[PDB]
Amino acid sequence: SYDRAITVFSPDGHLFQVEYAQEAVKKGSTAVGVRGRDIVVLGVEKKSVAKLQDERTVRKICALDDNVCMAFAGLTADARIVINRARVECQSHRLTVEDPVTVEYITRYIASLKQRYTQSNGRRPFGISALIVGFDFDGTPRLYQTDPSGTYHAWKANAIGRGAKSVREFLEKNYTDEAIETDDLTIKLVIKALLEVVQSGGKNIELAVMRRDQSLKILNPEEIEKYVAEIEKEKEENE
Amino acid sequence: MEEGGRDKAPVQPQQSPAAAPGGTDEKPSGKERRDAGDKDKEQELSEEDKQLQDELEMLVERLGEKDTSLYRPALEELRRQIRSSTTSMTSVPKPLKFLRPHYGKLKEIYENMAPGENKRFAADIISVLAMTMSGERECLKYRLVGSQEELASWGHEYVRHLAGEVAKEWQELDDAEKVQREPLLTLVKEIVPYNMAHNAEHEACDLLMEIEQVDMLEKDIDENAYAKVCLYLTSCVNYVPEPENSALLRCALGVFRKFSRFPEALRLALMLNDMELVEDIFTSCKDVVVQKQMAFMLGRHGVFLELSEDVEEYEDLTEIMSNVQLNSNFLALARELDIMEPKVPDDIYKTHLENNRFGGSGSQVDSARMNLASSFVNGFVNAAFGQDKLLTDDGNKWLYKNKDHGMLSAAASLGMILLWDVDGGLTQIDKYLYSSEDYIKSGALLACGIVNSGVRNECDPALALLSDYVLHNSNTMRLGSIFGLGLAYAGSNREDVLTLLLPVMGDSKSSMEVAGVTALACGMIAVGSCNGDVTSTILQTIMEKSETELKDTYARWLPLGLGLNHLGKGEAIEAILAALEVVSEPFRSFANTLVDVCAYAGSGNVLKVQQLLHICSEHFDSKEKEEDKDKKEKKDKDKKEAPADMGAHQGVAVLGIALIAMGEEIGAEMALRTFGHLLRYGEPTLRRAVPLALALISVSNPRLNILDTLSKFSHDADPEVSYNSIFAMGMVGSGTNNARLAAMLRQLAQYHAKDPNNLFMVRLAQGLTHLGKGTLTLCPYHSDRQLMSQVAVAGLLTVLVSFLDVRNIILGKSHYVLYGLVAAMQPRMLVTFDEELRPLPVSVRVGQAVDVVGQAGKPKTITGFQTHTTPVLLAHGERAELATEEFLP
Amino acid sequence: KKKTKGPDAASKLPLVTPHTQCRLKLLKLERIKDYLLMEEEFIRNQEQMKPLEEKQEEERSKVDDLRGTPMSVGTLEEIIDDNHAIVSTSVGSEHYVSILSFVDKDLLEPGCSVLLNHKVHAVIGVLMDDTDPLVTVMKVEKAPQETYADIGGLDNQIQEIKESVELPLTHPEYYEEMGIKPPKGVILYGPPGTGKTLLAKAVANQTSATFLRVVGSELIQKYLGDGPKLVRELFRVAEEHAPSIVFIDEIDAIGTKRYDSNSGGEREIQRTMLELLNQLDGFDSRGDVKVIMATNRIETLDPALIRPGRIDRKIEFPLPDEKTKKRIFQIHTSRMTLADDVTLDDLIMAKDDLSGADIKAICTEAGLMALRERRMKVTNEDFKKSKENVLYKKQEGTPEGLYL
Amino acid sequence: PIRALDEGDIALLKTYGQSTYSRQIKQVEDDIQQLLKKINELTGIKESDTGLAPPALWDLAADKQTLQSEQPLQVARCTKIINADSEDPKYIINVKQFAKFVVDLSDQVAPTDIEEGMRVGVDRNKYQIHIPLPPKIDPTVTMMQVEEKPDVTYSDVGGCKEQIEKLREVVETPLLHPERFVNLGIEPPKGVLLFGPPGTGKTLCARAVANRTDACFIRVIGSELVQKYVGEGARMVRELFEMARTKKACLIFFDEIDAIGGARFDDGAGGDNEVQRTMLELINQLDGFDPRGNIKVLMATNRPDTLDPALMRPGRLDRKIEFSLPDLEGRTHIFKIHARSMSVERDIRFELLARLCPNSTGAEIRSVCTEAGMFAIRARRKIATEKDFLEAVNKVIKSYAKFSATPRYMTYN
Ligand SMILES: Nc1ncnc2c1ncn2[C@@H]1O[C@H](COP(=O)(O)OP(=O)(O)OP(=O)(O)O)[C@@H](O)[C@H]1O
Ligand SMILES: Nc1ncnc2c1ncn2[C@@H]1O[C@H](COP(=O)(O)OP(=O)(O)OP(=O)(O)O)[C@@H](O)[C@H]1O
Ligand SMILES: [Mg+2]
Ligand SMILES: [Mg+2]
């Protein structure tokens, strides 16, 4: 109505185009992530393989460096563009200053890049929301979550994608004030968080972990079902 | 046209039957192998239940009909094997072979011979293979055979054995809801000899299981709502042993057999008391069973538990008789003071306060009768020990002002002001009793008798009141002294009090009202036996009423007392006896229908109602039988108050149109009594019908009839915004609704609407389905039946105690041994389940929940939680022990 | 006293609670039948045994003959003098007629219909009521069969509408104590085939006041002056009666944005809409009348019909979620014979876009397909064929997952 | 493939599991409904609706004078006269439904008091003039006027100070203190139009002025004027104004002028053009010569842009008052008005609520108040509290037509 341009103000002061691109993220597959005392783990679902093409070129989680991880939602090509730009930026920073890249610096850089496609006309805003997970500052973990508008925040347990609200609802009650040790218990929490897959195929979950120490670790489809079995075993204790 | 590529069965199973007559002929190979090859196919196709168009029956019926007709009768060489096979393979097709006229052909094949067990291939099929047509045959052919020739051939013995095996089959095929159709056959087989069905089904359920009986019990108990009287009694008595024989619960036997005390048989109640003393061995199973035995069914049972264990095993009788009554009074005091009850409200009369500005100014009411009605309002609203100290001195000044009759009524108001009191109510009355005034003394005696009414203990049976009775020097100071006694021993049929009150009517006093009150007292003292009272009453009627032709006070006390003395019996022999006793002139024949209907308190008999409406139908009644039609309409509500609630609505439909629109005297005058007696809940249907034809008095008709409609306006207890109507009617009651003719009526109605917040309930329905007693008094109160001019004077003596069968409102109470627990439950609407396989939700609206000892309310079902196990009666009794048991780790 | 409750309900008795081939139902309907026959017999005897009759007082026939046999009906418009009023006939021809006696000269009022003679044309009576057979026909008197038991679970909406239309009647003690006026207007909006008319039926089934039902594109006549007058008479007859309720269905045929254009017929439509809009909430009073108004698309309505004060509660009916589908399936197949094999879990969970009417059609199609091969019991494959083979028209969007 | 159910299969289908009480049931319902039909037919109605009086009132007058009243009098149809020939005894008359005839007087009537232009009674046969009649007073216009006092006070309108001042200036002051205008030398206007968004608060102000008016008030139905017959709307318009002029100090109030007419277009052949005439009959009657005087007219509408510009001529409509959404003190005052008659917790502040409803009119605030009451009812409470209003606000104002509810003010912190 009063929109259709990226630099106009509605009578009550909104930027309707940014808001319109805001909802475009929720069309993607959900993904969550949490941090722990020793381990940080992020999980993705809704892979829904088409069983007739290879799956090594459909990656959704990528490492911006050797000691940081990122996940995304929304459409695809913009994600690839941002990934490439971020990798170049972090490597250049390591070149100009010998210290490694802190998890906060690269997030702020991504925020600035997404910010600078909003002021001018003739530039369509990016349509993705990112999750950054790292621990690089003296062995301490953190995660951050960004927005298509260009503002970042610090969380402890987030959820994005189609239907993140229910995952929230689950999280704010099931996440415990108990500072979570025993990393396997954190992974159990992540599995039970993704348990609300809209169809629960059992084999539509994928995890990635990072234990303050080593590079990326990827789970394989043999411990996922043992975790499922242990979840059923704990759940059968209803009486 | 679908035939071809598969119909080889219409080829080979067509040639085999075609030469089957040849098999019965010289070739025994067809007699054996072909019979086997047909029977095996038939059994296989009717065995499975997957294809409901049987592929063998439906390709044979056309030829198979004549084949079976000409095979069995034209064989003449019936060997066991060949004839058995023929009967087996010609008995099954008949359901498809013939049409509805098949009752004469259920046996044309099966009866020829019994091949083994007919249920062997008819064992696990529910209502498909054979049990449907077998059930139909046993239902109808057996009844036709046993209509008069009950003792006959196999049609009784072997039919009995077949019924037993078919009941076993109904249980063993699927054990499904078709079990509730097994009682059908039980009531269709030996219709008249139902006993030999019901006992059989009892034994069959004895080794069935101890848990699958409850559904059968409920089905029978709700099938007993209406049937033949003898069938009703048989079904009730056969239900009685069911919770004992198969199941060993035996806890509801004491509750579901009190219902068979009066209606079933006096000896039935004797055996119920016998089983209640034989049982109750567990101490819990005695204090609960005795809770309802007094305050929920009737009195006169304080001496049946006085055996040689009278320390605690037989001291419970005195507890539940009167000591439990005192404890309940103390509880109903403490709880009421805890929740909602200020000492001296007296506001509802003063509620007409926003009208002070309306209609100009006040200072209009100066009527002396007003003071009477005011006192009655202040009495009725002040029940449940709402005593007013020195606030009743207004009644003392009015007692010293005017209205000697109003003085008596005001004096008697203190009876119901301090109700159900034993400590000091008599002491409070005694101070004003010695006042040297005849009316004051009579009112004091009435109040004293009212105070201990319903307690029926041995406190002061005849100490004070009877000493004045035996000194009946004054005409007025003689009736109430005896009349209250009748109320005081209403539940007691003690012959001592009966013969002691008989001399009141035998004194030949000039006061006919005294004789009437004595008749009322003797009627309301006993409701069962003692025909000698009936003989004495009838003799007094013959010797007195013959010489007089006065007001119906004769018809208001003699025939009413006669009906009360023989109330609630469907034998009709007592009805015929009293009928042939009093054949006389029509003014006395008014009592014929009264005594006829008083013995029909409640049952399903459309014959009875049909003759009830045919009797006073139109007749044009040119001042001939107006009293007869008046009692006919006043009683049409009776006999219909337990019709399974269909009859109530249908009756309201009939009365709303028939008598209301095309009526002259029975309609325009005595048509509001039936609504005033039909229900006491308060619903928009009747509350709308009444005012529309009532607030418009229709002065053209006997405008006083509209006044009657005012009284039944207050037929609803439990105060509500109904007031808002009558309040308005009060203002139009200044000019219209004549003050000198309807002011006291409107005021007493408005006092009855919001009368006593606690103890509001008064509907003679303790338990979901019980109405044992309490209708006795309520009948006399409503027995004014017009003649409100007479009521204006009589009521000052009568209306104070006219309705004195009030039970307390509240039913929800923990009722622990020390009353420890408070409450944990969810009150809700009435039941929402009858015969559901899925979970039974009794509580339609569980949203409502309270955790106090507070009131129950009329349309409320209560369920519990927090695992208290509530092992008393699980429904509601106001005195459940509810011991805890939670063996659930 | 007004015309009073004027209740509209047949509602004899519904207790067929066995809902099977049990004896209880047979005995109960036996009781119903014999009561009805009893009442019929009573009315026959009432009408057959009337012996009294004169009913003319030697003058009633005199008055009957003094007035003409084919009396006509006219419209009084003024009364200049006693015994010389002035009336008019249909064609607008006034006549300075006289007024005779035997006509209570109390209830006559300018605008009231009167009874006139032919030959001399004087006033001889007053016609008590005049309601055309377009408004009395709108009324209902036989309640529809459904009730709350059949609704598949809409607890929020049911509680809402109950607080709207039912609760102020039965228990009107709270509202006065709090000092609030209960709401009077309700809109039911949402996608098609969800249950908007079920609540109308269910409410009409169980109530105590008068019910009036009107469908949208019926308030329209072609004579340029009948629409608004018919609306006015509708509300007049509703208010003179009991605390009635009015149900206008498929509104959007009447109200849409009130813009300015050329044709005169559309001007008439706008004129009628605007008259109703005044009638609902205009000058002084409104009365004790509730209005329910149902539509399946709401954005195209005139902003003056929807503002609060005129319509106070709006109720959206959304598509069913997976909790409700089980309830719907349990209701619509209750009276069905059915086999131990089937499990409704697969049918309810496989799909995620369907409504109540769709479920009913699936049930009937599956049952019929079972009948096709000569059976009564229903199996799982029948339900599979019913769901997939028909009952699904399609749509497309978001191609090939641009989002991942 | 598939096959068609044959007769034998149909026969067997109605055969297995029928139960022993199938038809035995249905025949019952059948005859039930049939006897229902019968019992309802046997009932019809009764009337007793002729208005006959008690017989005592009839008296014996029925024979004496009612019988002697049919034959002596005549109908005497009533018409008007347009052009009285003077000194020439021929008159001209029109029935307004018939044609025009030349007619004369009767024998007994003087030819003096027969002033031209008034209603007369006329014989059916000879069309002679017999008696005069007073000018018509229209039956619908008699109850057109309110003759009643709605109980709404100036004290009950909050947040509209200026508009109340201007309306008072137009209506009340010239009717009570008519000296300031002649003292300074100005003339009082005679027409005010009201406009604003729907719900702003117009008709309420109109009702308020009809309480302290101390003068005749006339409510006018916008949709009553149009008629099925030709030539009716204009007639009622002129009757309205003449009857208004008869008495002194009467006010006129209109609603939805856009119903009667606010545009003029060509063609519209047939039915439409009639309404055109009607509106014209108003306009030329609204002004012209002979100042109307202390007769004031009010126009109120919600759709001002569709009005005929001829209405905005100086002299017809003089002042136009705009109603606007209340800013801040309007909201606090409106809350204070509608929430002084319900039980509330005594320590609640209303300015906080005034913040959280930025663009809202009086209707929405009133609905918020009642809604908070309902949420108090749902739980068993006697006195409503803070949280009640806080929840009702989310229920009403914002909830309808929301956007980005889940994103919320993520970017606006
Ligand atoms: N929740 C439900 N429970 C039971 N039946 C339902 C439910 N929802 C829908 N139905 C079914 O939907 C039908 C009712 O029609 P409905 O009220 O949905 O029409 P509507 O919304 O007025 O549609 P339209 O736009 O065509 O007029 C019935 O077949 C009813 O059984
Ligand atoms: N300033 C205000 N003060 C008090 N109440 C107000 C105010 N503004 C609006 N209202 C409320 O608005 C409601 C109706 O207002 P009103 O009838 O005047 O609207 P309107 O603008 O004439 O509408 P429409 O043009 O649609 O007829 C009333 O309940 C009134 O209390
Ligand atoms: Mg519909
Ligand atoms: Mg308005």
CSV table of N, CA and C in Angstrom, one decimal, chain A residues 15 38-39 59 63 71 76 80 93 103 130 140 148 165 170 180 191 194 204 224 229 236 239:
chain,number,residue,atom,x,y,z
A,15,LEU,N,9.4,0.4,8.1
A,15,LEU,CA,10.1,0.1,6.9
A,15,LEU,C,9.5,-1.2,6.4
A,38,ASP,N,31.7,-27.5,28.3
A,38,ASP,CA,32.9,-27.9,27.6
A,38,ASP,C,32.6,-28.0,26.1
A,39,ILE,N,31.3,-28.2,25.8
A,39,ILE,CA,30.9,-28.6,24.4
A,39,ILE,C,29.9,-27.6,23.9
A,59,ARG,N,25.2,-29.3,1.5
A,59,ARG,CA,25.6,-29.0,2.8
A,59,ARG,C,24.8,-27.8,3.3
A,63,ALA,N,31.9,-24.3,8.1
A,63,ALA,CA,32.9,-23.7,9.1
A,63,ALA,C,33.5,-22.5,8.4
A,71,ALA,N,25.4,-21.8,11.0
A,71,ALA,CA,24.2,-22.4,10.4
A,71,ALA,C,23.3,-21.3,9.9
A,76,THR,N,18.9,-19.9,-0.4
A,76,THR,CA,20.2,-20.6,-0.4
A,76,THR,C,21.4,-19.7,-1.0
A,80,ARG,N,25.3,-18.7,0.5
A,80,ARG,CA,26.6,-19.0,-0.1
A,80,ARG,C,27.5,-17.8,-0.2
A,93,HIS,N,41.9,-10.8,8.3
A,93,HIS,CA,42.2,-10.3,9.7
A,93,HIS,C,43.3,-11.1,10.3
A,103,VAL,N,35.1,-14.8,18.2
A,103,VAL,CA,33.8,-15.1,17.6
A,103,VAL,C,32.9,-13.9,17.4
A,130,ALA,N,21.4,-16.1,10.6
A,130,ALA,CA,22.6,-16.9,10.9
A,130,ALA,C,22.8,-17.2,12.3
A,140,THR,N,36.7,-20.2,26.0
A,140,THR,CA,35.4,-19.9,26.5
A,140,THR,C,34.4,-19.9,25.4
A,148,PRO,N,18.1,-10.4,9.3
A,148,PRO,CA,18.2,-9.7,8.0
A,148,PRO,C,18.2,-8.2,8.2
A,165,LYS,N,8.8,-21.2,17.1
A,165,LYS,CA,8.1,-20.7,18.3
A,165,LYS,C,7.8,-21.9,19.3
A,170,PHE,N,9.2,-25.0,24.3
A,170,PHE,CA,9.8,-26.1,24.9
A,170,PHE,C,11.1,-25.7,25.7
A,180,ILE,N,24.8,-27.0,32.8
A,180,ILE,CA,24.7,-28.4,32.3
A,180,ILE,C,26.1,-29.0,32.0
A,191,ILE,N,18.6,-33.5,21.3
A,191,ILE,CA,17.8,-34.5,20.6
A,191,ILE,C,16.3,-34.3,21.0
A,194,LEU,N,14.9,-31.3,19.1
A,194,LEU,CA,14.5,-31.6,17.8
A,194,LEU,C,13.5,-32.7,17.7
A,204,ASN,N,16.2,-38.0,10.5
A,204,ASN,CA,16.2,-36.7,9.9
A,204,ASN,C,16.8,-35.7,10.7
A,224,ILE,N,23.0,-41.9,16.8
A,224,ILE,CA,21.8,-41.2,16.9
A,224,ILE,C,20.7,-42.1,17.3
A,229,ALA,N,17.2,-44.7,21.5
A,229,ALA,CA,16.8,-45.8,22.4
A,229,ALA,C,16.9,-45.4,23.8
A,236,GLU,N,10.0,-44.5,29.1
A,236,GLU,CA,9.1,-45.6,29.6
A,236,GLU,C,9.0,-45.6,31.2
A,239,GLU,N,5.4,-44.3,34.9
A,239,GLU,CA,4.8,-44.8,36.2
A,239,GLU,C,5.8,-44.7,37.3
